[PDB]
Amino acid sequence: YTPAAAATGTWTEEEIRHQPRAWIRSLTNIDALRSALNNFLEPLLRKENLRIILTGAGTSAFIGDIIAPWLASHTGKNFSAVPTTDLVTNPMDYLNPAHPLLLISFGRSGNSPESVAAVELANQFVPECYHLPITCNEAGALYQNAINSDNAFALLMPAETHDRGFAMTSSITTMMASCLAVFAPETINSQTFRDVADRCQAILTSLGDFSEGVFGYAPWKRIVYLGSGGLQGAARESALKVLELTAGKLAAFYDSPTGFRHGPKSLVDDETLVVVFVSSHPYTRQYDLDLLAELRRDNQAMRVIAIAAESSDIVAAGPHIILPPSRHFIDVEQAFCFLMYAQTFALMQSLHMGNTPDTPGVIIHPWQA
Amino acid sequence: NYTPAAAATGTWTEEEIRHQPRAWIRSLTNIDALRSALNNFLEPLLRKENLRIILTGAGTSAFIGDIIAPWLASHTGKNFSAVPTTDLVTNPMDYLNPAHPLLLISFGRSGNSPESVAAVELANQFVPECYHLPITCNEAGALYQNAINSDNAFALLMPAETHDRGFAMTSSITTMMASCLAVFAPETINSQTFRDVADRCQAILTSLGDFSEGVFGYAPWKRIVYLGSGGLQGAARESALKVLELTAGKLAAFYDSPTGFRHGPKSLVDDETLVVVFVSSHPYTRQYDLDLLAELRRDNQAMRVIAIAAESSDIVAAGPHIILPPSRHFIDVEQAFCFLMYAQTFALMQSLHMGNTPDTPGVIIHPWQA
């Protein structure tokens, strides 16, 4: 997984390119920590009333949006996603004193004040409270606070994932892969996830030096990413990347294909790029493809791009990207592949407009006065 | 009682906005009449420790659960959550848990949205012990009719005037929302207490006169962002969608929470952007809203920053602002109704101002069994 040279000279490009290698590094770390993790988590997961909340701010909030439903379904446990920004402003709406809680806290720096504030609020509100921070900065407040507790097991990501770029890349993907591997090791582990790393390395290789812009370049003023279920979380992250790296010059939006029909589709104009992240689950994929057919037929957008594992007549009919050949991926695995395109697209839009992509607040109030 | 002023735009949307306070009290007084039937249906369900309660709808109807599910969860201590029908239909396996009983609260104006009916069928297919409470505006719709035809269901019909003729839902959404709150939290939200909300929203509408001033005005903004904390983010989302719908996309619209806004999305603020902040009435929560407002005011980069709040303060008064009519203290789910009055009427007048016709400004269902 050796990265090619970062010809743009940005940290962001380096951080995109070092992702496949970072992912496998993280999962081999989890293998080394597996007994310790099981000894911490197994007694918790045996509590039938356990709530597990995945929490982060900004990009870190989207990890939960992508994986929490899959984890709930897969494990049969009570996994949900609540951003740290909602926990901090409205703790009473989300923290239930009547059940035990395991709070999975994500942080690239670990220094957003909301990260430690949410942990403290959880401890205040929930009598039987446990923590698994997953973080990229050993020196961060979030990790430092956790080592200073006995209800916490903090998991450090590989050092290179402490992204220096303003926009998170390897931090989000590595934390997401790590969370998946912690709770679903039978499915996502240091062996199976090599297929995901290999395919994402192939995606990056397929894009060469990135100079052709991934989706190209055009005077679009609006971008919309669409994905079903948890892939909507990937669409949200993809939109935020565009927005951050273009300093808001390109307006960005996200939705699910089916949700998009209920009003939001009015945003599509002849200066709009629409990108569809097509599900690999055939039942779900039908809905993605029906919407793709509609968007192609509508003739409103500047460009409609389908990104899919499988080529089909509607996918191939207009602008499209077929993922490199691989085994069947489930949608949480596909999320990594889609993000490779969205990250690289956003980087190159930023550069093309002459921006500096690496460089393109909150006061915590106590619950008790 | 709550008699609307004349709808001088000649639009169904204006008529539907103005008849909201009256419709709310009509619905809650109906619930009073149905209370003992409701209680007979619901009390045995709510006694089930492991019950999941899902609030579901599409589009605007999805945002009801976004506004009220967390409050309902915390207020009642029951397992309330919101999942849009659009997610239930595409990814049922990710949301419908066969191991627990389910009560599905289905919102639908027509009751005929293919996704509404599909979500009901999928919930029945996936969840062995499944119950339904559709809240709907159409007596002849599938949601209502299927429910009354089955023993696992109890359907609640909204007042007839709330079957909105306008493309953009107004009285349908607010009346369904008030009804849902009244069903599950009648000790707090009821045909008595909610009269203060209807009264205040009637005062808001009166304060806007014939609406010709356009509410926030007619400046040449190109982007609008609504911000609200917690469940008010759902109100912000509905507010954004109304603008987008009624202007046929011409005004780009965004939503977020005040604290969420700092982590990237703030980059969207430019000198053609209007930012509207729905300030919490909760004394903890509002501190965060006001710190963010202060930051946006200090930045001075938006075309306009408008705070809407129950109480003025230096921060709120240091730029464009609207203070709500005087009333008793409202909780945030009550406030949502007040904020929506401004958002709906703003969107309607933006639409008309640009020469659009606001009243008039699809999905295939596939079987889970292939």
Residues 6 or more apart whose CB falls under 8 angstroms from that of A259 comprise A232, B58, B59, B62, B84, B86, B87
Indicate the CATH number for domain A194-361: 3.40.50.10490
Query: Which of A354, A357, A352, A356 has its CA nearest to residue A217?
Result: A352
In chain B, residues with a C-beta closer than 8 Å to the C-beta of A92 are 74
Give resolution in angstroms.
Answer: 1.8
What distance in Å separates residue A202's CA from the closest CA in chain B?
29
Cα torsion angle, A198, A202, A205, A210, sign: negative
> In this complex, do B90 and A240 lie within 8 Å of one another by their Cβ atoms?
no
When the candidates are 3.40.50.620, 3.40.50.1000, 3.40.50.10490, 3.40.50.2300, the CATH number that belongs to B1-194 is 3.40.50.10490
Give the C-alpha separation, B67 to B72, whole Å.
Answer: 10
Minimal Cβ distance to A69: which of B58, B95, B241: B95
Measured between alpha carbons, how far is B180 from A196 in angstroms, rounded to an integer? Answer: 44
Q: Which residues of B touch A286 (CB under 8 A)?
A: 364, 366
> Which residues make Cβ contacts (< 8 Å) with residue A138, sequence separation at least 6?
A156
Q: How many other C-beta atoms lie within 10 A of the C-beta of residue A49?
A: 12
B90, B95, B101, B104 alpha-carbon torsion, rounded to 10°: -60
Which residues make up the CATH 3.40.50.10490 domain(s) of chain A? 1-193, 194-361
Task: Determine the Cα–Cα distance for residues A95 and B188; give it in Å rounded to an integer.
Answer: 21
B287 and A261: CB-CB below 8 Å? no
Strand-pairing partners, residue A79, are: A52
Write the residue in B90, B231, B362 that is nearest to A284 by C-beta: B90
Domain covering B195-362, topology: Rossmann fold (3.40.50)
Is A256–B87 a contact, with Cβ atoms under 8 angstroms apart? yes
Cβ separation B287–A365 shorter than 8 A: yes
Measured CA to CA, the distance from residue A275 to residue A232 in angstroms comes to 12
Closest CA to A180 of A9, A23, A338, A359: A23
Size of interface A-B (CB pairs under 8 A): 176
Cα–Cα distance measured from residue A274 to residue B83, given in angstroms and rounded to the nearest whole number: 24
Residue among A96, A258, A362 minimizing CB distance to B259: A362
Contact B366 A248 (CB under 8 A): no
Contact A248 B257 (CB under 8 A): no
HSE-up of residue A281 (Cα within 13 Å, Cβ side) = 21
Name the closest residue on chain A to residue B62, using Cα atoms: A259
Contact B74 A57 (CB under 8 A): no
* Contact state of B252 with A267 under an 8 Å Cβ cutoff: yes
Residue with the two structure tokens 């709510």: B46
Chain centroid to CA B139: 21
Domain with CATH 3.40.50.10490 in chain B: 1-194, 195-362
Tokens, residue B117: 């009916």
Write the burial class of residue A346 (CB in 10 Å: 0-12 exposed, 13-18 middle, 19+ buried).
Answer: buried
Non-local CB neighbours of A74 within 8 Å, separated by 6+ positions? A184, A187
Å between A2 CA and nearest CA of chain B: 30
Other CB atoms within a 10 A radius of the CB of residue B346 amount to: 25
| Of the partner residues B70, B87, B259, the one whose CB lies closest to the CB of residue A85 | B259
Identify any residues that bridge with B321 across adjacent strands, giving them in sequence order: B307
Of A59, A268, A282, the CB nearest to B249: A268
Kindly state the greatest CA–CA separation across chain A. Answer: 63
Residues 6+ apart with CB under 8 A from A230: A65, A66, A67, A68, A69, A70, A331, A332, A335, B91, B94
Contact by Cβ (8 Å): A264, B168 = no
DSSP-assigned letter for residue A55:
E
Q: Taking CA atoms, what residue in A is nearest to B369?
A: A283
DSSP, collapsed to helix, strand or coil, labels residue B365 as coil
Beta pairing class for A134-135 and A155-156: parallel
Partner residue opposite B264 with nearest CB, options A70, A83, A244: A244
Element (H, E) at B82: strand B79-82
Give the closest-approach CA distance of B1 to chain A in angstroms: 33
Q: How far is residue A143 CA from its own chain's centroid?
A: 20
Residue pointed to by tokens 């420790």: B49
Contact A76 B99 (CB under 8 A): yes
Question: Token match 């595409």: residue?
Answer: B90
Name the minimum distance, in Å, from the CA of B304 to any CA of chain A: 17
Nearest CB to A266: which of B99, B233, B245?
B245
Please answer yes or no on whether A267 and B244 come within 8 Å at the CB atom. Answer: yes
Inter-chain contact A92–B115, Cβ cutoff 8 Å? Answer: no
Q: Do A93 and B62 touch (CB under 8 A)?
A: no
Among candidates B90, B265, B267 on the partner chain, residue whose Cβ is nearest the Cβ of A287: B90
Cα nearest neighbour of A81 on chain B? B81
Q: Tell me the C-alpha distance between B285 and B307, whole Å.
A: 15
Q: Which residue of B115, B223, B263 is the best one to mutate when testing the A interface, meaning the one whose CB has the most A CBs within 10 A?
A: B263
Between CA B342 and CA A309 the distance in angstroms is 45
Which one of B49, B246, B267 would you mutate to disrupt binding with A, by most A Cβ within 10 Å of its Cβ?
B267
Put simply, the answer to whether A361 touches B262 (Cβ < 8 Å) is yes
Which among B107, B105, B85 has a CA at the least distance from the CA of B95?
B85
How many angstroms separate the CA atoms of A222 and A249, rounded? 9
Domain spanning A1-193, CATH architecture: 3-Layer(aba) Sandwich (3.40)
